[PDB]
Amino acid sequence: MSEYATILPENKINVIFRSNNKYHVPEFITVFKPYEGRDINLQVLVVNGDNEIYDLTKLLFYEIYVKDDTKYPWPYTKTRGGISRVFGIRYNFDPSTISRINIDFISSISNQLDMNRFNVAVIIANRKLTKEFHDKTKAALIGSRIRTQFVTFTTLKRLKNRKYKATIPLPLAVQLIAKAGGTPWIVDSSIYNDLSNGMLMGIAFARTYSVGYFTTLNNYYQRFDVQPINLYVPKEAMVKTLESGIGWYKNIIGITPPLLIIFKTSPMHKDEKEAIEAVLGKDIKWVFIHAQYNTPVRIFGNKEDDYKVNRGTVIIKKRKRWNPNNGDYLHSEIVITATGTPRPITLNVYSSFDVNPIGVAELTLSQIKADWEHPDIRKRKITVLKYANRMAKIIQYINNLSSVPSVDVRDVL
């Protein structure tokens, strides 16, 4: 049918953990442990806090994350104690080493960072500081061993509220794992075969430059390409970024990608179409997805209930006026209704082939779960767009953009 509905359960998409442990729930990093973990050497730097804040800091990063006597229960497949046990990684933190800084914020933090001893440097401060100096800090420490992890006073205070104490610890240990050089999980690459190897470049705009966050189909390898623009990517900029991404893909893999998937928040432009077909010619298939986190659609249920529709419902409408042999490429439109993913998504697909719409729906869901910040329901988004935008935000502060290709996803995440 040209306009119908379906259900795409999360169980068809997955994330991978140690020894090819597969489950659709990212929060099960606690069960199967991080896919490819490292050792965390933590450095907590509390900034302008009262006593209670320091007791909360010790509670969180020492008793919950280290002390086994403090038998903290973890979300799923819990035993007790802290990071070193459930995650099977070397977590090292000395509560006596917590640095007290009376804040110029960036300089004060930097003088207190010891890259030779620590891999991670958590920075604790109120919301105003964690907002003004988050991206600036992330950019100012590009290439250094230490990766910073901001935590607000409010989140520490929520450790006293019981229910919040049982949900905040995991979406900070997972980020500590990521920022230590570890991989919480990689995407189940098998999902990209219902759509019909490749790239998933996300396009963002540093407000100006265009940011292409290129990544493999399992998100294992990532790379940012930044091209000045003299919203859409001009033909020359898109050609340059595509050539660079294909070079990187062939360098890491050994071949050119047989399928390029692209994400934008705007509809495909004519220049983008010409550039795509110029670099990729006709041999490499391309899918392009204009994604919006809102939809005027409002689907209702039957009267036997209060007009409630089961979550996972997806509305497909395949544009019949599609012909890729004459410059017509808008293939279909997918509306992923959702309550997990907090926002509904609408996807305008452009395609040079008969791209399966439920295929791109699965792409978008597996890219939702691919995000290592998948815990913290609020922040659930498409991975490539999300970190393309993170890189766009922090590029305003990076001075030598020649380091952009070397930047890691963990320096923005």
Binding site: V297, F300, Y307, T313, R321
Partner: protein, 190 residues
Amino acid sequence: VLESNMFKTEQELPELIVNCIEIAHKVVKEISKYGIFGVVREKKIFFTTVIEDDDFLKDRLDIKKNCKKIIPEDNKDYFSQIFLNALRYVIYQKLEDINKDKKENERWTINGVYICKERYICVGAKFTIKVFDNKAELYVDRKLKSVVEPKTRYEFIREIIQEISGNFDYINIKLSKDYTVNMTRTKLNE
């Protein structure tokens, strides 16, 4: 089978023959009351109308009769605005009937097209038009100018649509003497 808030034509929109004049953004809003549905682009107003009288048409507003033949798929921004003006005309015409035996605080007005229906901030029905695949799609949603159960939204859109077209499953927006967009509520087959 599921329902939705979408009404849409069951066939591709026939070519829209539109008259035009040269000059405005407020003018198109005001003349939509009388039956002149226009869109302002390239410093011109491209419009259709239900007024079957040239003299009255000129008095309300030279007029290039049948000056353009728009294809909505290639001119989505034209057809969307013309359709919105036509929908506003329809609602304006039905407002007198709607506000017959109701309290003064329970009377509907127009502020897309928004029907501010219950004021305390007022809750109303917002209309959106999209051209896709050379077809017209109209969405009606409960809005506030907040989070409510699906039932209180379904029963709200049902009231607003029944008090416009008299039946919840369709709506007819007249663009001119010869063109009428007939939209039917869509039941997305599972």
